[PDB]
Amino acid sequence: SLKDEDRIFTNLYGRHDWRLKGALRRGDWYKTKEILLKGPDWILGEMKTSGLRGRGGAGFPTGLKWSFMNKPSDGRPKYLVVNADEGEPGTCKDREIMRHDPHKLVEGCLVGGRAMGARAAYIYIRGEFYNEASNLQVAIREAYEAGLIGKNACGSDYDFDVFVVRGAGAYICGEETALIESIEGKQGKPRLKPPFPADVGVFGCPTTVANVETVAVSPTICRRGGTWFAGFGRERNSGTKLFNISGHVNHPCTVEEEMSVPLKELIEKHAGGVTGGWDNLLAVIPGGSSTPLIPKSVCETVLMDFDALVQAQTGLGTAAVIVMDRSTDIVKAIARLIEFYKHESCGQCTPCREGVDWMNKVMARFVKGDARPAEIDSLWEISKQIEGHTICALGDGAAWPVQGLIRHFRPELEDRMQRFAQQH
Amino acid sequence: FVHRDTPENNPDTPFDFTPENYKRIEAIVKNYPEGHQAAAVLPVLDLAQRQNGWLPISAMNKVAEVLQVPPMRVYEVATFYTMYNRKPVGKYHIQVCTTTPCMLRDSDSILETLQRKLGIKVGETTPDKLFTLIEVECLGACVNAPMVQINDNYYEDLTPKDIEEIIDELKAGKVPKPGPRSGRFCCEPAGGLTSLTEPPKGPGFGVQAG
Amino acid sequence: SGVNNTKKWKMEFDTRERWENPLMGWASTADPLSNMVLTFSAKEDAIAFAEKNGWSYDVEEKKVPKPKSKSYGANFSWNK
């Protein structure tokens, strides 16, 4: 599977100094100058060969993504935006990187810029995490002191000035076009994609956005080479990823295990075991709230890699595993996720604004069982109207859990329908 | 989402960044790109919130003034984000995560415990003005599910008893242990861990040649 | 914002007296050709109708909206 010798993030769960001294001891900032000296090209070949997929909600080939803003500058400073907003529910994945191994992030940002000529990078850590940022800020201060970051980084002529931006409790801020607008200081509402972020981004200057995990692994991969990373996985879903297990399991934890490992093994080797026995598994949410939940019979068969999941009709996403024993009212579980999205969508687009509120009202009635059985496929149809028509992906995300509940748990919802009709 | 003139909250309410605050304000301005100050409205609005939790209409007017932006521009930012409070809040503003990870593991019970001790319903503030309870959504840190963020404290993995105990420390005395209250080391598996046992590999270990 | 009523040319006779009616206050008109608006597909055909029927005509050229360049990316420009 994965050996400690072969691990990208090697300071998880603390136990070690998050400061530069400890980070250096661990082996961070190694020949960083040489890396930059290798030249932006060399870094993207590394990432490309690495097959590092985006560790964010949606995995886009890192190499290509970074490559786009590798086109010649048109007189506007290129920029780096690192989304440190851990918005996805069930995902404490990133919080760990910054809190425990921040300096890795710092170097990653530097390596990141060299890859795309960003004078500076801005890290949008969610405002909720006030404590988390301070630590990161401290580490950054130290790196400037070391000369690691700032003018002539590591002596290399490259000049990089990293920043930390306060989030303000919005899941949508996380979106790529909306992170920018929050950075820009306007309301956090995703812009459209046709002018892509590379071409126009933060402050209308070439900009690129990466999940903090994606920025963090790039230096280790650069130093340790693309092949190493490439070997651990299969085809595209190739790489080491932090997988989180939260809910109805013996030991919730963020493992860090290698990718494409059997769902069972992940929750078996680590995570203790499904609380109450593997057979007490009403369903598994593989990528977090946005991805559709998969019921037990499908799960062990399938494993956690993006290709395998899309075959399964679900998304690897943030790889946040939320598990539901046979002791849970799923109709109400998914219902609160729709409540999670009505309290959160920006309302900029018509399909998400009214559609997500419409499903919330129907879902609440479904939990009570007040609604008739015919309404259940009605919500199917409302779901796909929202799925393909939304300006951003959150409407994409709201539709999928609804679709999953109807797809695998249609008989249970009908019974809740039946239960209320009987008592009158 | 509408503001109405009231003696307690009006442009009349006095607000001005402390000499120390104003200093902070500029620090924010240069962090952002030159010629760009508008981008700092949020960070600034946050320091107005740091100054005073209420952040009345008067405070937003000043923010727009200091940041020379259309006032509405600040009003829109304050309304969109839940982090900003446009109403006075209690001393603690206990925020309980009640979304799927936390729902699982009974966050509601924790809510019940909190409500009981505070003798107040969710979304209501104690007359003591030290406590204000709100059912917030995913606050991150799910591996530790039972959870209640208190002014960033982000207590984690809490059982109902711990919650009341925490309130006790806050109710009369110093703050409780910032962070989780369980045997698990951070987000290591609950009883110990089964990973990263090997000592950290040496700098340059298995470094790809050149 | 629909433009389906700005397609065909129409020729309309000049407006005339509309005095109030004493008994009920309804509008009253003595001009028969008031409510008549004939619709003609092209300017040339409408001009022909006026000439053979002997009514005086004063044609107004169609004015169509000028092409306007729009692009979502352009307003995102902090510069301008």
Partner: peptide
């Protein structure tokens, strides 16, 4: 282990290590 003004003050300190930022070149967007 941090007071409310820990971050901003830290940021003020970070200024000793930053180049003069660039500008779009206009008085106000």
């Amino acid at each position: 282990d941090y007071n409310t003004y820990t971050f901003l003050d830290l940021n003020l300190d970070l200024s000793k290590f930053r180049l003069p930022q660039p500008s779009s070149g206009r008085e106000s967007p």
